[PDB]
Symmetry: C2
Subunit: 213 residues, 2 copies
């Protein structure tokens, strides 16, 4: 609370074109869904994520999740991360992760996401980011959220741009990804920008739609 | 709403022995799970179910859900029902329905529930009822909730008694169930009783457990 404001919590639900979307904390029983999607989407994920030095299938066995989940929840207990699951109609379809959380005179964090490729409804990732931003700039009392994305990652750049992230810079040789140190764009948005952002319009419309009897 | 206070809404989540439990509105995408479970559980449910005048397999076919769901949601829009789904770890595992809602000088409604047979006897129904009661006595601004249960339905009588329902009477030949008009006990609880009730203790403990980081 003092140590970890806004954690644990849920975010949403919203009703968006894909269905009902929400964020809620990672938990041990997510092992099966997490494993299934991460294994299936290896070609979508492995070359776009930081290198782990591990075999992908070994890493994403069902039996691997407990240690990972425990680690994420430990960081969240220290107020350094907020590890959410993206739900579509109550089902695990990905993760929305707030990381490197600081307060003091910085009050900033990064945000990362991934969504199962099998869910084709569209707007799931943007809704997740928009919910994450609203939660961070209210309950978590943050001032700024940033993200890093390779210039070559056309779909992710579009998702981030859509909800209102601004390009702030180009980080040279920033992260070890797909066998090399790769440039990443740095994008960001601050709390002053949220009310006029697409992210706010998405959440407001999503809540209005959800609340329609 | 003026017309439908407390609707639509979610209730919970709680963490209880069975897992994470919550209530949320019925929706069209529930057709597959509702149909699968109600068909599989025919012989657990049908001896206790008000008669519909049609074959169980016809009534609970996946293509039957849209009209049922639309009807429930229409009644809710008029403030006469609150039709919830019981979730366990985000999955449809039954229903919690508030019906015959009145306000004025009565402020009463009935509550009914069912839980998937493979999941029963684990605290899911008691949690669902406790959440229902809390929601009814706060957001829906009700004063009284009642339920009906056949004297022969020993497990349901135990579930209802556990959370604080009082026996008030025996309704002779009350509902058409399993081929005849069957006696049902009437049980009830009023808002004055909530603070000292097992229902309140369950919800408070469930909220506290959920909030543990
Ligand atoms: Cl949860
Ligand atoms: Cl919902
Ligand atoms: Cl139970």
């Amino acid at each position: 609370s003092a140590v970890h404001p806004g954690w644990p919590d849920t975010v949403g639900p919203l009703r968006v074109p894909a269905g009902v979307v929400g964020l809620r904390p990672v938990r041990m029983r997510d092992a099966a869904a997490w494993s299934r999607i991460r294994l299936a989407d290896q070609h979508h994920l492995e070359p776009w994520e930081p290198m782990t030095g591990m075999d992908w299938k070994v890493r994403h066995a069902v039996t691997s999740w407990p240690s990972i989940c425990s680690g994420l929840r430990a960081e969240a207990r220290h107020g350094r991360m907020l590890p959410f699951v993206i739900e579509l109609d109550g089902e695990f379809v990905g993760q929305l992760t707030i990381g490197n959380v600081t307060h003091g005179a910085l009050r900033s964090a990064w945000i990362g996401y991934w969504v199962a490729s099998s869910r084709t409804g569209g707007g799931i990732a943007t809704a997740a980011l928009a919910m994450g931003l609203d939660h961070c700039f209210t309950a978590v009392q943050l001032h700024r959220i940033e993200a890093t994305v390779r210039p070559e990652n056309t779909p992710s750049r579009a998702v981030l741009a859509h909800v209102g992230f601004r390009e702030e810079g180009l980080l040279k040789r920033y992260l070890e990804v797909d066998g090399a140190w790769r440039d990443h764009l740095l994008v960001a948005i601050t709390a002053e920008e949220l009310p006029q952002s697409a992210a706010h319009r998405l959440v407001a419309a999503g809540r209005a739609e959800w609340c329609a009897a």
